[PDB]
Amino acid sequence: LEAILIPDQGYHQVGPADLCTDMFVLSVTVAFPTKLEQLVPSTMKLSAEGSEFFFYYSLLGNDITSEPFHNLLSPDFEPERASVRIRSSKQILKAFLSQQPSLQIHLCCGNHSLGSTDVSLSALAGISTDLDNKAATVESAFILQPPKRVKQTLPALPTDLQPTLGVAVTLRRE
């Protein structure tokens, strides 16, 4: 199963076009970054202003970049939503989402990743038990991790203040 973009119609076909004809909307919201400064080592001194950061992920092969921000201590980040339209059948779409790799969201500087988190799209498929009547949403604050630590250190506990990003993934009929 693959999501084929129909450029003139602005949706992605999942399944046979003559059998799978229902319209769905898959939305990703990113919001409320916290403690992003902890993704940068304390021995790396950034100048007060002049840096530009943003968030990136890929949604069904579509590149999604947030508005830029310049202060890791206070991103002042307005919540941002991206949505893709999908023409499929309820059962085919769930199977497709169950086979997808995790949604990977990066804190970026240029083309460098300062940290990333994974959001399970197969978990969204599992809770999509009532799409005829209610949209299904996977939502939480997800922990951001830097790309490469040199040595193993004592892991942070889930109760600890770590870099996090609010991520909500919602699936519904159109």
Author numbering: 168 to 341
Could you share sentences copied from the article?
Using X-ray crystallography, we show that the ciliopathy-associated centriolar protein CEP120 contains three C2 domains. CEP120, for example, plays a key role in the duplication, elongation, and maturation of centrioles, which in principle could impact the production of a functional basal body (Comartin et al., 2013, Lin et al., 2013, Mahjoub et al., 2010, Wu et al., 2014). All three C2 domains of CEP120 (C2A, C2B, and C2C) adopt the PLC δ1-like topology II and are structurally similar to each other (root-mean-square deviation [RMSD], 2.4–2.6 Å), with major differences found mainly in their loop length. Thus, the CEP120 C2 domains probably play a role as protein-protein interaction modules.
For the O.n.-A200P mutant (equivalent to the H.s.-A199P JATD mutation), we obtained diffraction-quality crystals that allowed a successful structure determination to a resolution of 2.1 Å. To obtain this crystal form, we introduced an additional mutation (G307S) that we found serendipitously. The CEP120 C2B (H.s.-A199P) mutant structure revealed an overall preservation of the C2 domain fold and only subtle structural changes. In the WT structure, the O.n. A200 residue is located at the end of β strand 1 and its side chain points inward toward the hydrophobic interior of the domain. The replacement of this alanine by proline causes a change in the main-chain dihedral angles of the preceding residues, resulting in a local structural change. In the WT structure, the main-chain carbonyl O of O.n.-Phe199 (H.s.-Phe198) makes a main-chain/main-chain hydrogen bond to O.n.-Gly333 (H.s.-Gly333) that cannot be maintained in the A199P mutant due to the conformational constraints imposed by the adjacent proline residue. In the mutant structure, the loss of this hydrogen bond is compensated by a peptide bond flip, allowing the main-chain carbonyl O of O.n.-Ala198 (H.s.-Ala197) to form a new hydrogen bond with O.n.-Gly333 (H.s.-Gly333). The most significant conformational change is observed for O.n.-F244 (H.s.-F243), the side chain of which moves to avoid a steric clash with the bulky pyrrolidine ring of the proline. Other structural differences between the WT and A200P mutant, in particular the conformational change in loop 1 and loop 3, are most likely caused by different crystal-packing interactions.
